[PDB]
Design a protein around this ligand. Structure first.
Ligand code: FAD
Ligand code: FAD
Ligand code: NDP
Ligand code: NDP
Lengths: 447, 447
């Protein structure tokens, strides 16, 4: 079998490129070793956010207790899992039906290269004129003793019962979001992180408020401790934590792998196709084309790209690859502001540069950082943690970055994104009119 | 007593101008016939939004019932009133303390003009070089029989107990927002509106979904019926409704005046100062200066201005008046997009032009209207009503307006505001990156 385009993975990147390429009369083939839809839809952003919803109900009631609410609901684990599970189950049929409907050849096996332009799909041989690697990323294989007793983000999202005690290895997005969920549903939770700081790429002047919020929730955070072993006891697990000071041991029903997500490229036999790759994924140029094999493109978490491993980024990288495969190399990938969020309660969000990174680019900057728990918006919702840090280019009076924790920040952060992209002057923002009363109306006050 | 500036009203407009003028070394005087802070802070946006908060808790629980929540909280009227009351009581001391601190002379009586440049404050005579009318607006005096049994928006916001049955006269913002509150707290509610359409200045293709949402909530909406009398029965009120077809009578514990808000200018003896006014408020030029008396300025709901009677508008009108009083007439008032919201659940929001108004300006337009109750964002929150209408200038591929109902619309509408003001191209918006999963991420899909 010979195609114009063969795609590895039908997550956000792979789908985006299948549908677009098919639409311009190319012959399209695509395999996923798992149900079609990718990580976000099946085992990431979407199943998570559904579940977070039921926690939002408890937290909001807990917050106005005695101020007009007299009962704080317990979350019904089964019911919300079941509700989550419905969005999950309905996704693959939808996608497949879209493929058969667009004239896209569909496969359901793991893929290895046999040569430059040729693929072993399950127990078949397949060839193409252009190949795309959109296989995303996968839980880190924990190399040390007991490593394999680490359950995944995906396992977490599938649990029939919430354990009595959880422990997350690695203090990033997942550990914190899943700790909030787990804690709000009535489980003890521990996060063990080898760094001196959690959530290391966020503005620590902001992070500390979430760390505060997290601990008030009863969650244990251990810093400066590397996890080096797991041992299964009677209906328990026992975890080794190594610091400079000591080795300590932690007991919990259930241990989870939060330790970051390497690209899903290491079982692909890329060497057999003369395809250049680092440990951050497939190596790409301005056209998202591989640097040795000129017939290969990549997009999403699998791509060693200047873009953040996020759902909207996999799509934008999709469109450049799709377009360059279709018309030849003509379009260079261009990244706008890449807003990011930690779906804790309260949510934290960031866009553009941190202080530290703004200084590294030798910008003369203004910083505005303030803790504003006393502002009407935080006060009326009884959310204790509300703080912001903005970074203004002093010379052009345009925004370079903004980092927020508090109510609706996952929404509000997009206005800062729009602001950065449109190169809006700080004064045009100050004299602009918002709906009130809203969180958006606090922006003029952050400068 | 002789001042550089005397201000009538310390709501948003009056405050804004006091503080700014004082700050540039002018002598400032200011009276409010009520506690300092204005309608928004004391008897409008702020006390309302606090209360709406406790309803958000019930509605969100009601929405995920059986999907992970097993109890729908009753709202504790006293407790939330008491909570509301705290924000209300803390406002005037804050403002006064700001005045004494800025060197602002403070008065607490109703104001009438005695002449061109002269004011009767309580039982005093006062003169100024520039005078500002920032007296906002006031419930309509209901002229007909029983008119005076109509309780106010303000009375509503102050109730010790929620009645068993409410009836609102006039189907605008207040009737709908207060009906939602009242209904969610367990009272029967009726809205009586003389028009064929409710919420007449909104896009009716959107309004109808809120009308749908409102009726599913058990609220009675009567159209094409003018209210012509009220009669107090035994622990009851009985209301006359006149249509073409008939006269019908409605019984309720409590009747409220939702019938629109004339400017608070008609008891000011403006004639005695040769001050030009229509029934929409004090007549103003580009400088927000009166058109006969050249020493007078106005700002906010009291001003017959091209701006919407809203908290953020009173502020922007403040700054032009303040600035022109300070440096002389030099600055013309300029209005950006004026986002507006109906704090029902679900919220509805609008910005820029309706279809009908876009056509009136002879724009070649594209319209995108869709009901999207099936979108992930509505589905995961179980909000039945999610719909949008956008209006694109066909020629410049920039937005002219957008009208939304659904989750976080009061927030999302500001992105459309930013979009209109920054004259962002529809494609730059489509290829821009949002945080996901968020309501903001549905914008590219509305075009
Ligand atoms: C728990 C979790 C939460 C997240 N939350 C968010 C969030 O809130 N917001 C956000 O923006 N991003 C979030 N992300 C990141 C987001 O999921 C990714 O950035 C996005 O899925 C990238 O799309 P992709 O197409 O590159 O990869 P994917 O969507 O994962 O698609 C790749 C596909 O390749 C398949 N595949 C892998 N290896 C092979 C192989 N050898 N053979 C065949 N098929 C293969 C996979 O099964 C998968 O279906 C989250 C990730 C996780 C794990
Ligand atoms: C129930 C309600 C809800 C609202 N919700 C919103 C909302 O959610 N968002 C929004 O943007 N807008 C909202 N508004 C409108 C908003 O309140 C006004 O646009 C805003 O208050 C205008 O400010 P202003 O300074 O012109 O008037 P005000 O803020 O009312 O200030 C005028 C002041 O003048 C005083 N005064 C009046 N007459 C006299 C007199 N003769 N002598 C002395 N003092 C006098 C008044 O007591 C008052 O303190 C709402 C209004 C109401 C009634
Ligand atoms: N809202 C969103 O946008 C979300 C996005 N995601 C996506 O998922 C991925 C995030 O993965 P996540 O699991 O949070 O990991 P992160 O990379 O965010 O952080 C994990 C941390 O774990 C530490 N760690 C590694 N090994 C150990 C160990 N043995 N003991 C203790 N700590 C250890 C690492 O330290 P070190 O760095 O020093 O090696 C690292 O800092 C990204 O692709 C992200 O885009 C995840 C959820 C939410
Ligand atoms: N979220 C926000 O921004 C909010 C803003 N506000 C502010 O408050 C004001 C809105 O006042 P509101 O009370 O909602 O009034 P609106 O002007 O919005 O609408 C009231 C309606 O009542 C009708 N009406 C008048 N008399 C009768 C009668 N006898 N019987 C039946 N219907 C009648 C009127 O019909 P007709 O027009 O045909 O004469 C009118 O359409 C504005 O200043 C607004 O800015 C209010 C609350 C929320």
């Amino acid at each position: 079998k010979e195609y114009d385009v063969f795609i590895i993975g039908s997550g956000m990147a792979g789908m985006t490129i299948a549908n677009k390429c098919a639409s311009k009369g190319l012959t399209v083939g695509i395999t996923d070793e798992l149900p079609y839809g990718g990580t976000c839809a099946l085992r990431g952003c979407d199943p998570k956010k559904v579940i977070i919803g039921a926690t939002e109900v408890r937290d909001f009631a807990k917050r106005l207790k005695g101020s007009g609410i007299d009962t704080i609901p317990k979350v019904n684990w089964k019911d919300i899992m079941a509700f989550k599970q419905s969005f999950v189950d309905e996704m693959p049929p939808k996608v497949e039906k879209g493929y058969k409907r667009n004239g896209i050849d569909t496969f359901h096996s793991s893929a290895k290269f046999l040569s430059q332009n040729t693929l072993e799909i399950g127990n078949e041989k397949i060839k193409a004129k252009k190949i795309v690697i959109a296989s995303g990323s996968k839980p880190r294989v924990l190399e040390f003793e007991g490593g394999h007793f680490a359950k995944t983000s995906a396992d977490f999202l599938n649990l029939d019962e919430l354990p009595k005690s959880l422990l997350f290895i690695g203090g990033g997005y997942i550990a914190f979001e899943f700790a909030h969920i787990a804690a709000r549903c009535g489980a003890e939770v521990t996060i063990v992180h080898r760094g001196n700081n959690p959530l290391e790429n966020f503005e620590q002047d902001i992070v500390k408020h979430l760390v505060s919020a997290t601990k008030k929730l009863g969650v244990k955070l251990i810093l400066n401790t590397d996890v080096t072993a797991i041992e299964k006891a009677d209906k328990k697990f026992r975890v080794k934590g190594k610091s400079a000071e000591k080795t300590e041991y932690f007991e919990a029903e259930a241990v989870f792998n939060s330790a970051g997500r390497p690209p899903a490229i290491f079982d692909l036999e890329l060497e057999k196709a003369g395809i250049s790759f680092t440990k951050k994924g497939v190596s790409v140029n301005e056209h998202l084309q591989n640097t040795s094999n000129p017939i290969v493109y990549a997009a999403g978490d699998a791509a060693d790209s200047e873009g953040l491993p996020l759902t909207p980024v996999a799509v934008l990288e999709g469109h450049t690859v799709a377009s360059n495969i279709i018309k030849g190399n003509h379009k260079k990938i261009s990244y706008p502001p890449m807003p990011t969020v930690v779906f804790t309660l309260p949510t934290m969000a960031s866009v553009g540069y941190t202080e530290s990174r703004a200084r590294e680019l030798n910008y003369n900057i203004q910083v505005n950082y303030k803790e504003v728990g006393d502002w009407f918006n935080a006060k009326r919702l009884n959310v204790a943690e509300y703080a912001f840090k903005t970074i203004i280019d002093e010379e052009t009076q345009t925004i370079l970055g903004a980092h927020l924790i508090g109510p609706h920040t996952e929404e509000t952060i997009n206005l800062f994104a729009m602001a950065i992209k449109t190169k809006m002057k700080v004064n045009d923002i100050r004299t602009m009119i918002f709906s009130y009363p809203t969180l958006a109306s606090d922006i003029p006050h952050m400068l």
